[PDB]
Amino acid sequence: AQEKQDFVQHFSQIVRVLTEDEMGHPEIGDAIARLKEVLEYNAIGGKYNRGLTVVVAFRELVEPRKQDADSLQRAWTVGWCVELLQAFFLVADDIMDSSLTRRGQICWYQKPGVGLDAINDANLLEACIYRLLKLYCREQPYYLNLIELFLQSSYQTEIGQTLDLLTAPQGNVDLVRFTEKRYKSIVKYKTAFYSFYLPIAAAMYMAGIDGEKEHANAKKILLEMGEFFQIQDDYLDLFGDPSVTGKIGTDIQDNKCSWLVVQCLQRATPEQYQILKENYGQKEAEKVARVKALYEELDLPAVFLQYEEDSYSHIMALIEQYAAPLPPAVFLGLARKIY
């Protein structure tokens, strides 16, 4: 909320530190300038919810007598690592989907004189994560824990992306691969691990809570939250209010494996399957319009409303069962935001 503004003032330092360390290394200066420009363009401009979840979870987890200036600096920094992870995926995903814009502005790769060099820029964003961890956390006992958490998060995200790409190739309608089992799997690997587990898990490690069982417990809660966030993201893509949401969805144009299309397909009498087969994923409006209306005719907006109520109950039951011995608030803060 106000904690945000603080997180963002810290970026300047993040950047300073990552774009200087050549003082006996002159000649690489120009690549360092380019790294400065990649960071400023790609890490800034989002809502920062993931990085901040790190900072908030850290405050709530650490028995207050161990929060000095330096401990807090390590939390802002690790929060910024989560944001750099995000940045890395987005720069790359935008190239792969040929997107035009991101966070309201021109995608980095679409900028004149960047193009496919953005592939190296994305790799730099990733590498910046480990450079930060070494700079700030090298002497901490949880250092290796965090390196492995970031590496694993990346791999989960990447393999989820591979699954998404095998499942939903833009320009090729095949709804035989749009199943519930496959929708759930994409979300867990591609979105939920890094969006929800990673930031809390990182806070836990910084707090000394490294147990397998405790982490599995938190993960159970957080992956289920992640599933909901994304299902809500998909519903709102089409049925959101663009003023409240902040852009019009193209999930259906893009032949996305949307929670909607999945639900739609669970409920289609053979004709409707065809109505969807001849309309899902097309440039033109009348085709998208007709899909939205098919959705409305199956009362998907109400299936969603029912799903969200149930899902909310279920999350609370999960917090009740699996939060201890972590303060339930760690999870409830995130529930409040996503619901």
Closest chain position to Mg ion (CB): 233
Note the Cα 225 to chain centre separation in Å: 12
Closer by beta carbon to its own copies, 185 or else 272: 185
Write the secondary structure of the chain as one string of H (helix), E (strand) and C (coil): CCHHHHHHHCHHHHHHHHCCCCCCCCCCHHHHHHHHHHHHHHCCCCCCHHHHHHHHHHHHHCCHHHCCHHHHHHHHHHHHHHHHHHHHHHHHHHHHCCCCEECCEECHHHCCCCHHHHHHHHHHHHHHHHHHHHHHHCCCCCHHHHHHHHHHHHHHHHHHHHHHHHHCCCCCCCHHHCCHHHHHHHHHHHHHHHHHHHHHHHHHHHCCCCCHHHHHHHHHHHHHHHHHHHHHHHHHHHHCCHHHHCCCCCCCCCCCCCHHHHHHHHCCCHHHHHHHHCCCCCCCHHHHHHHHHHHHHCCHHHHHHHHHHHHHHHHHHHHHHHCCCCCCHHHHHHHHHHC
Q: Which of 7, 11, 58, 88 is catalytic?
A: 88
Q: Which is nearer to Mg ion, 126 or 237 (CB)?
A: 237
As beta bridge partners, residue 102 has: 105
Q: Which of residues 39 and 257 has its CB atom nearest to Mg ion in the complex?
A: 257
C-alpha pair distances (Å), 187 with each of 25, 63, 158, 180, 277: 43, 34, 12, 11, 24
Does residue 196 carry a catalytic annotation?
Answer: no
Closest CB 249 distance from Mg ion, rounded Å: 7
Q: Is the Cβ of residue 80 or residue 235 nearer to Mg ion in the bound state?
A: 235
Query: Which among Mg ion, its own copies, none contacts residue 95 (Cβ within 5 to 8 A by kind)?
Result: its own copies
Rule CB under 5 A: is residue 83 a binding residue for Mg ion?
no
Residue 164 annotated in active site: yes
30 is catalytic: no
- By beta-carbon proximity to its own copies, the closer residue of 254 and 308 is 254
CB of 32 to its own copies, least distance (A): 8
**Interaction partner, residue 225 (its own copies, Mg ion, none; CB < 5-8 Å by kind):** none
Q: How many residues bind Mg ion (CB under 5 A)?
A: 2
117 has binding-site annotation: no
Write the CA distances from 304 to 21, 301, 308, 312, integer angstroms: 51, 5, 6, 12
Query: CB of 76: closest distance to its own copies in angstroms?
Result: 22
Any catalytic annotation for residue 21?
no
The residues, any chain, with a CB within 8 Å of residue 91's CB and separated by 6 or more, are: 42, 107, 108, 109, 118, 121, 122, 125
- Pairs from 240-249 (Cβ < 8 Å, separation ≥ 24): 247/104
Q: Which is nearer to Mg ion, 187 or 276 (CB)?
A: 187
- Residue 79 contact partner, candidates its own copies, Mg ion, none, CB within 5 to 8 A by sort of partner: none
- Catalytic entry in 11, 188, 196, 234: 234
Q: Catalytic: which of 7, 74, 150, 164?
A: 164
219 is in an annotated binding site: no
Q: Please confirm, yes or no, whether 229 is among the known catalytic residues.
A: yes
256 labelled ligand-binding: yes
212-251 mask for Mg ion (x: CB under 5 A)?
A: ---------------------x---x--------------
Whether 287 has a binding-site annotation, put simply, is no
- Name the residues that contact its own copies, by CB under 8 A: 27-28, 30-32, 34-35, 92, 95-96, 98, 116-117, 119-124, 127, 130-131, 134, 143-144, 147-148, 151, 154-155, 158-163, 165-166, 181-182, 184-185, 189
Residues in binding site for Mg(2+): 93, 97
List residues binding Mg ion (CB under 5 A). Answer: 233, 237
Binding-site residues from annotation: 47, 50, 86, 93, 97, 102-103, 190-191, 230, 247, 256
Catalytic sites, residue numbers: 47, 88, 93, 97, 102, 164, 190, 229, 233-234
- Binding residues for dimethylallyl diphosphate, by number, are 102, 190-191, 230, 247, 256
